[PDB]
Structures are given as C-alpha cells and as structure tokens.
Design an enzyme around this catalytic site. Sequence first.
Site, mmCIF file in Angstrom:
data_model
loop_
_atom_site.group_PDB
_atom_site.id
_atom_site.type_symbol
_atom_site.label_atom_id
_atom_site.label_comp_id
_atom_site.label_asym_id
_atom_site.label_seq_id
_atom_site.Cartn_x
_atom_site.Cartn_y
_atom_site.Cartn_z
ATOM 1 N N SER C 150 58.570 78.710 1.812
ATOM 2 C CA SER C 150 57.806 79.609 0.954
ATOM 3 C C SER C 150 58.080 81.052 1.338
ATOM 4 C CB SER C 150 56.304 79.325 1.060
ATOM 5 O OG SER C 150 55.546 80.290 0.342
ATOM 6 N N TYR C 164 48.986 77.832 5.531
ATOM 7 C CA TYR C 164 50.100 77.403 4.687
ATOM 8 C C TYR C 164 51.366 78.234 4.955
ATOM 9 C CZ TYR C 164 53.074 76.549 0.650
ATOM 10 O OH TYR C 164 54.148 76.266 -0.162
#
Lengths: 234, 258, 234, 258
Positions: C150, C164
Amino acid sequence: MFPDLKGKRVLITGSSQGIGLATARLFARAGAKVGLHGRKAPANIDETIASMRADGGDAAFFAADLATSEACQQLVDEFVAKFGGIDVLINNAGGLVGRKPLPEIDDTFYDAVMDANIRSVVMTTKFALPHLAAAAKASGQTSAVISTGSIAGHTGGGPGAGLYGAAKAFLHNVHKNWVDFHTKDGVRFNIVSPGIPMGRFGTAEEMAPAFLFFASHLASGYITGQVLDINGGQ
Amino acid sequence: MFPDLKGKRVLITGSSQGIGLATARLFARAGAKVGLHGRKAPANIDETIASMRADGGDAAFFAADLATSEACQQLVDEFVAKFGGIDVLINNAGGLVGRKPLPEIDDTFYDAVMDANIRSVVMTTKFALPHLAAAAKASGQTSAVISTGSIAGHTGGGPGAGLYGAAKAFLHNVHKNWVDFHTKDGVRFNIVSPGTVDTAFHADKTQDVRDRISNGIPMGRFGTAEEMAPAFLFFASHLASGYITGQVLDINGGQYKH
Amino acid sequence: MFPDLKGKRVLITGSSQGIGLATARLFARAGAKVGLHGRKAPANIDETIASMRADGGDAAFFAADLATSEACQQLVDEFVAKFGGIDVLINNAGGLVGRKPLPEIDDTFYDAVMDANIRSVVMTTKFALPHLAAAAKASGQTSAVISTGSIAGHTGGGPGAGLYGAAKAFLHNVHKNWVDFHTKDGVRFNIVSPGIPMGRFGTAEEMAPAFLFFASHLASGYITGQVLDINGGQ
Amino acid sequence: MFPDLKGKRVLITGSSQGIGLATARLFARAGAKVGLHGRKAPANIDETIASMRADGGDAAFFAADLATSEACQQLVDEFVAKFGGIDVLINNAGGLVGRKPLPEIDDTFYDAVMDANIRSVVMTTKFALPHLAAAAKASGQTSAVISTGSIAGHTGGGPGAGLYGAAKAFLHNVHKNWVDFHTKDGVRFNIVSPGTVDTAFHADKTQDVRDRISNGIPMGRFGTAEEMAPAFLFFASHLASGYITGQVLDINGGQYKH
C-alpha cells in the site's frame, strides 16, 4: 551546547542571515571560532562579531559568491589564514534562486540554481577536506561536514522549484559517496533540512541545535550519512 | 546534556543493560527521573540506581514482560504512581527471541517476535499517551516518544532475523501515523535506529563474523551503547528538538546493510 | 500478457473480488492455471471459473481464512493437490479490517489487523516456498512471489489505519530478507501497491498488468525486492 | 511486448549500444518507430536499422551531444521532422565521463558529468514535452517519459563516481516535480534504475573486481541489457501502466550497493 565545541574552528557558508546566522550565534556561545559568510557584508557585521565574541567565541566575516570554484577555494584559504585550520564545515550557501516551470527552464536559470546549490557544496567541501582531515588526525576524534538539505530533496520541489528540490536530493546522495570514501579521513558527513502536523512554520532557532549536535563528536561520533528533517511532521 | 531534561520523568523500556542502560545513565546525569525496566531485575540494579541518584537524577526499577497489553498498562500505571506523570517515553524493549529461517517460523516463534517488538511498542505508547499529552499541556512545550529502530528496519534482517527487521520497519512506519494524529496532543515521535552495537544483542557472534562485519563498516567497528545515548536525549529535549518529529536517525558508522 | 505465463500454476490469495479477481482473470487469459481464494465462495463462482477456462486458462476455488497458519498450510496443500505445484504466489489476502485511533487499539483489533495482513503473508509464503523452489529448479528459470502493499506502507496509514500502513511496511521489509536468503532457491519477491496528480482513483484493471509483469520471468527475471506503486502520482 | 506500442513514436537517447540499444530493438519488435541516438553513428548502425525494420518497426539515427540545450532542441526537432510527433521519450543518454576522487574534481570534470547526465535529461524532456502532451491529447490516453536512473542514485556512486551517483539521485527526484505539474498534460514519468549490467559501461573492470561484485549480488551475476528492456516497454505502454507514474523500478538482481 556541547562542551567539545569550545575552540572548534567552524566555517559556515551562507551565515550572514537566517538559519546560517542563528546557527553561527549558537556555535559562538559554545566557544567556537566561527567563519561568517555571505555575498556581501551585512551593514551591522561589526555588532554581530562583537556579540559572538562577548558570548565567549570568536568570529570573522568572509565575502564570496560560492557559485564558482575559485571563490570556494579563496574562502577556505582565507578562513584557514584567519583561524589556522578547520574542524567543522557547514554548507548552508544556496537557495531557490527563482521559480520557473519546466517549459521556462533555460540555461541561465538552470546554471544559477545548480551552481548556487550544488557546485558551491562540492567545491567548498573539496577545498576544506584536507584541513578537516588534518584536524581529525591531530585530535584523534572526528571533523564534521554538515550540509543544508530540504524536504524538497525527499518529495520533490514545489511550483517552479523542480531544480531546487532535485539539487538537494543530489546533496543527500553525494554525502553517501563521501561517507564511503572519506570516513577513513576522520570526517563525518550529515545533513540538516530546515500540511504541517505541528500547525506552524519552523523558526531559525529551532533549526540550529541540530547543527551543533552533528558537529559535536561527543554527541554524534558514530553518526554519519544522516539526514535530519526539521519540519514539524511535514 | 540539555538543561531542560532536569526533573523530566523518563520511562525507558528495556533499560537493564546495553543501549537502554547507557541511555538511562545519561538521562540521570542530566537530572532526569528515570524508570528502569526489564523482565527481571539485573544483579547490578542497586549499583545502577545508586549511580543515577549520585548524579542528581533518580531511578526506580519496574519488572514487566511487555509482550502483553496488561503488562504495558501496569508498567505505565506503576511508573506514574512513582513519579507522578510522564514527559518522555523511550520504547527500547524488544529483541531477536531467536534466529529461525522462514521454513522454521512457526506460530510460537512468530508470536514471540511480534509481541516482543511490536505489540510492546504499540500498547506501551497507547497507555503512556494521555500522560505525555497532559505533561505537554501543563508545560506549554512538548513531550517525547522515542522508539528504538534498527538498520534492519531499512535494509532487512540478517540470518534468521526476517521478522525482527520487519518489526523494526513496522515501528518506523507506525510513528508516521502517530505524528499525523497526535502532534496536536503536544507529543513528538522520533526514532533512534542503531546499526551494529557492541552489546549482549551480538554476544553470540563468533570472532570471524564480528571481524567480517567490522571490516565492512566505514568507521571500522561496532558502535558502543554510549554512542547511541546522546541521540535519545537530543530527541527528548524540547530545547534541542522541539520542531523535530517523525524522524528516523541511524547511528551506524556508515553501515546500511547487515 | 506474456507468453511464458501459459501453463503457469498461479495461487492468488484474496482473489474472490476486487484487484485479486481482476488479476486472476488476466492470468487465465494468459493461459495460466489459477487458484482463486476467499473466506467464502462467491455465489457466481461457477460462472467465473467457466469464463477463465473459456479464456484459455484453468481455475479452481479454495476457501480459507488465512489469519491462521493451519489455514495457510491447507490452502497450499489443496492448491498443489489440484494443480501439481506452484510457479507464482500472489499474497493479496488482507485489508483495513476497521478503523481505530491509537487510544482505541485493543488486542482484538490489533490481532485482527496483524493476523489478516502479516501472518497470512508470512505463513502462506512459508508453505508455498518449497513448491516455488522445486518449480524453479525444474524449469531453470524463476518462480515468483508478489505481495500486495500500500501507499500507506510508505507514508503511514490514514485515520484509524495506523496498523494497516505499518503492516504493509512490514511486508516491504520482510521481502528484503526473503530476497537475501531465497534468491538462491530461484524465487523472486516483488510488491504491487494498488492529492492525486492524475485527478482520479485507480481501477482494478489498472492494478493487474503489474502483477503479470512481476510474475513473468521473461519480463522481470532480473527484478527482485521491488515495490511498484500504482497511485496516479499520489 | 504490448499491442498498443505498434506505431508509437519512441525517441531513445543513448541507444547506439548497451541498454539503450537492447531497449530500442524490443520497441521495434513491438512495431514502434524508434529514434536511435548517440554522439556519433556506431559502425553497425545500418545493420541495427535493418533488423528493426525487418521486425515491423522503423528506425532512424540522430547524432547529438546532449550536454548542451541547443543539441537537445535540435534532436527533438529532427525526430519530430522524421516521425511527426513523440509518444515516448526515453532519457538514457549519460555516463561516467571518468572516475575522479573528490580532491581531483575540477570544473572541467564536474561540468562534463553534470551536463552529460542532468542538463541532457532536463533539456531533452523540456523540448519533448509539448509533443508528448499533444500526442496524449490526440489519443485520449497517455504519453510516457522514462529516464534511466541507477542503483548509485539510491546508495551512492562507487570509486570516483560521486557525481554520477548524485546526478542519478537528481533524476530520481526531479521526476517527482514533473509528475506534480505535468500529469495534467497527459504525460507519465517513470524511472528504470539498472544495477550492475554487463555493458561497455563496466568494460574497464578487472576480472577480480567483476568477480567480487558478482559474488555479492543475490542473483550471482551482472544483469544483461536485455533484462533491462521489458521494464521500459512496460512503462511506455498505457495499456500496461496507464495509472503508474513517478515510480522508480530497480533492476538489480537483489543488489542495492556498489
């Protein structure tokens, strides 16, 4: 701010104003012998020198435009003639020069930005190196080079500032080569880099202690090749 | 090393030995009130506390295994009960646990590494945060969180240390989130990332391995624990680093890979 | 999209929907034998498999929650039982789970995020490794691991997303260790990571070709330890 | 390698030999119309052009020393006169010039390295930009700029190559600015960053040095020019990489330092 800065011979390019001057004032307070530099002598230079001497240090001013190698050589020679050697070099000469988008970047603008920001650092460091090495050999400790970077050297320059950000990225990288090949000469190379989580812009006083930290063998003797951003989380 | 550290309440996890201890000693010399921590008290703990007090600081030892959230909360609560608040948290607890190649990484080992190095930092910071924020509100300055990273967090863990390197990379990143959302609470988050340091951490290495590593480091040797300490004080001092947050400072003698 | 993907045995975790599914469809078009995976079988799974077979590939679906090691082991075993080996592993299982600010991060939320995003990747790669190595030994080329990262693994997670982003940063780093110690086993490890200069959000179709590029020895045989962000300049 | 490269007008600086040439060949195999470039025509230039045309592409050679802005403008103008526009610019021209330690870096050497590696890329991209933008406007898709970086742009240049590494770091960064302000012009900017590649670039190295390097690379060898090429086509293809911009892709067999 660190006891081992007393008597250190500290040449600070671009120290006639702003961060460079604030940093120079802190070094003088620490008892350092400081080389002040700019293109032109400030009108109040005598007062500034007097204050630095009152604070327990020494100071002298040197005028030069470091966009050419000969000016870099002359600055180093003049500084050594005055103080007898070099323990710390701070490469703080440089700046935006101007703002031009890519279609407007001609040779004259390119040369201006690149000479002011890169040639100045490469050549001043080159000419200072033998002095820095001799100082470290004599003390058995380390000499220090600290160059001024930018947040733009990480994430790119803003509007019209493409070359400035990239020039600072250049400095970040060339320092890595200098670490690899001149750590053996007892010189440490580090960088200080003066929307925002802290909700405010930084001051010149907030940028200065980091320079003294990187200059002090006591504080940072095992630290080299680092880039310390002072940006309130930007 | 900085005058504004006098009287500061500094909790240092993993400070029984090595980097954590050297850092604790320097804080106490600066007049700080230091929380010493380990899983159990070292044999020399009374001597350590005595030296720190002689320096004009203060010290108390707290035992905890920070692999569980309960232990992290208890440590913070006990520290606050002793010293009345928190100005600086140093997350230095952690470790390899062991060296296992990927084929040998089972849940027991994975959990041990991840809990020791990540859950410890997340939970201890969580529980310390309200105290750190209250201290900053009261002083009108900033409180500090400093976590110990690693060279391995940049370029990867060595033999059997894949999880350890990646855990340190996790810490490097999670600090960015904490800067984004807790700067407004008056807390600065920074990381000191040691390279190869002459501590118990590397005591298992043969002379051949130590020599090999030393020859590849530009400064020609492992760092000392004492060479790590000033950076922690620098990041802890609002006077020195009040506009500095979200930084990772590597102390590695020019070394960037294992 | 690359001729050397024909017949390749490609296990794609988290491929029942989104980027994972789009990527699976491209591999099947390239003639690959594809392992589809999710916690639950989609209602239209038979149609999806039929389409992938019509496109010139093969497909089978495997149900598993990869938050536990035993589920990762079972998935790998089931996939190998079906297709006879593994040439490509794509670790795309994972996700946000939820959004909780630091003061609200309890053990149950921490465990959820960490198991879904990290334990899944570590254990699935562990169990797939001997198969990936055997495949590379047999062909004399390379096998491929591609994990989904990400933008948050670079610059930090957004609101409530601290764990995350950091979990993805973990993956970026662990891949470096895997490069150092398993390049000798003929496995390449790369990452694809699905305000914005391009002025729009990306599509699943725009994320897929990068996976095939990293999977193809022809295209990327000397490429390992890379992280390719697909973010329109974000 | 991608069907949408057929007919694309691709200017590749520094494409007489090595990586640039291997890349040019692959583009022509995909049916692209390729501008070949060097300071002077290589002995094999007619053979090269013939092979590219046999593949269903096209090729023309342009001589230029891109150390001056005038030469960059002339190259772009000549390329557009031949092929009618520009869809892809690959900035691969550059080189060491020589190896000089810091004490030996005079203005002549500094200028030679900086002009060859930086001014060339800045000015060639500047002059190509209006053409690239017009092509993207016309197609409703994107045009591409791909510049050749280096491993050295991440971790530093080797012996006497301080300026070369830093010049490549400059390119890595300046691309970020171009993404920020020229994405709206329909141009994607990406970098292919080779590690150690078996080309004329490293022909000076002794067997001992080559062996030493090869042993430290996880894949156990230098890369080939052909191993660099597919990445350029990938970044050039809107079909393949239309949402990808501002990326630096290293092709290094796992190697990150010289």
